[PDB]
Symmetry: C11
Subunit: 68 residues, 11 copies
């Protein structure tokens, strides 16, 4: 099952899980401060992930960067 | 399952999930502001995804860009 | 399961799902306006897809372009 | 399951599906006009696909052209 | 299942399916006229395929040509 | 889903011979190809080895090999 | 199942496993000192991993480096 | 399931199938004359194959030659 | 199932297996003298492996080196 | 569908020794090869390790290696 | 299932199997003299392998060398 790597490039970046299922709402928001790395799978509970704030992101499709 | 990465290049980009099944309709519209990134799977509820607004998109098939 | 990416290059492009099974008919036609992207799986209900109108298409086999 | 991409290069192209099973006959013919693209899987009901008319075809084994 | 692409380079090409099982005989011949393409799988009923007449053939192991 | 071999006869009377799967090994079928005909043949529940006699151009997943009559 | 490699680049690095399921919280924090390597899988109990402190990290998607506060 | 290609480079090349199971002995020898090719699988009955005589051999690990 | 190779670059390298499950603690420590190699899998009982001491390490993601 | 090794004897009297799978480990068979013969041998229900003694050229999925007598 | 190749570069190399499961102990030590090759799988009974003595080692991650005593 795949995962995504998120490195925060400033304080207060939010990595947000969206619920798997008929319903789509947030469920959890993990706060990363500058320099922290989160490596997060898709799961039974999470089928979409949003990143808000400035971060360096790696997936199986390559690098992408979110901007705050 | 496969997933798509979508980076909003302007405010109010919509990532819309179409229902899996005999019937096809929108079940969910996720609004991304400029710079946000959504990493979204195909799932039991979502078998097609439509992007409206300017965005940079990655899929297993490479890059493509939606335009406003 | 495989998917196809379709970017509408003009207004009114139609992405048409054909039914899986002994019977073959159109069960849905999704209209895309210019610059909209649809990423669409093969599914239990859809075993062939037809694109009509000017579009840029990616699949596992590479890029192809439909014309209006 | 694998699929074929067909792009019609002229009007009137036929993409014809052949029945899986002990017997072989055509169960559907989809007409493509010039510039339309069909992407079609092999399925429970279709184990062979015939293309008639001028089209650009892609499969996992690369490009081929019908005339 | 694997499949073979046969493009007929003259009229009257025959693509012949041989029965799966302890018995081997031809169960079907699909006749192709010049420039027709047939994309044919191996199946519960067809474990060998013979081509007669001039054709350009593609398989997973590359291109081969048959000559009449 | 099994592997397959492509055989192109380079002369008349080429034989593609199927050997039986199981405890018993014997020839169960011999397919005659004449010059320029092609046979694409799988390994199967009944065929676990394939013998080619006569001049033929053969492709497997391991590459090209040629049999000589 | 996938795993991540983490090499601590200073003392006191924490590799934090987050619980799998509807609930998200830290269930374990593994402390690494300078020079030590942890190779950790995703598991039934850990579906996200956070790294705090300076570390050199490899995953299937390539190298990334965490930086400490 | 894997297979070995054997091309006899002289008469009387012997391709020898060894029994799968707790016991090991030969259960079949298939002789090849010069220029004949044998493509043989590993099977429920054959878990090791010995080639005697001069032969050109392909396996998934490359080419090897037996010397007779 | 994945494995790591550990080559000890000095005496007393410590390869530490952490228990798989809701709880985390070490369940085994295998010490290596200089020049010894351990090739160890992820298993039902081990889901994380820590290396202490100077070692040359190979995994599917490339070479890494622990320092004592 | 297991892996297999290719052993080509470079001298007479090479031994390809199968070791028993399971809790116990012992030689269950030594196949003797003479110079120039090739054995292609799988891992199986009964054989989980293979020892080669004598001079031989060996291929496995990780490359070529040579045993010496 | 994966395997490792070990070629002894001196007499008396040991290839040691560690038990799979909750208990970890050596259950077998295979002695190789110089020039002999052992190709050994991971198994229901062995989930880690230690090599002691000078040996040339191939795995799916490439070449490694153990250095003797
Ligand atoms: N308990 C959460 C942990 C998690 C994994 N991926 C995430 C991405 C975003 C937020 C939380 C998560 C889950 O299993 O789904
Ligand atoms: N709850 C939705 C979440 C989702 C995943 N991918 C999406 C794409 C678009 C809109 C919503 C989604 C689902 O499980 O299907
Ligand atoms: N409800 C449809 C949605 C769909 C997927 N791919 C499509 C292609 C064309 C039209 C509709 C679709 C289905 O699950 O099949
Ligand atoms: N109902 C048909 C649709 C179809 C798929 N691929 C085709 C190729 C040709 C004709 C029809 C089709 C099926 O599932 O088999
Ligand atoms: N009804 C036949 C159709 C077929 C598939 N592949 C073929 C190759 C040759 C001739 C016929 C076929 C079958 O399912 O087997
Ligand atoms: N009836 C035979 C047909 C066959 C497949 N591959 C072959 C190779 C050689 C001879 C016959 C065959 C079978 O299913 O096994
Ligand atoms: N007992 C934990 C061990 C572990 C694996 N990967 C981790 C990452 C971080 C923290 C602990 C772990 C588990 O099986 O999940
Ligand atoms: N009946 C034998 C045929 C065979 C396959 N591969 C071989 C190699 C050598 C000798 C015989 C064979 C089997 O199924 O096992
Ligand atoms: N009867 C043995 C044959 C065998 C396979 N590979 C071997 C390696 C060495 C010795 C014998 C063998 C087995 O099935 O296991
Ligand atoms: N009987 C042992 C044989 C073995 C395989 N690989 C090993 C590695 C080291 C020592 C013994 C072995 C087992 O099946 O596990
Ligand atoms: N009995 C342990 C052996 C082991 C495998 N990999 C390890 C890594 C570290 C320590 C012990 C091990 C197990 O099967 O899990």
């Amino acid at each position: 099952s795949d995962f995504v790597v998120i490195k925060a490039l400033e304080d207060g970046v939010n990595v947000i899980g969206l619920t798997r299922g008929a319903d789509t709402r947030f469920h959890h928001s993990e706060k990363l401060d500058k320099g922290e790395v989160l490596i997060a799978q898709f799961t039974e509970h999470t089928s979409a992930i949003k990143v808000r704030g400035k971060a360096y992101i790696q997936t199986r499709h390559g690098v992408i960067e979110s901007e705050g």
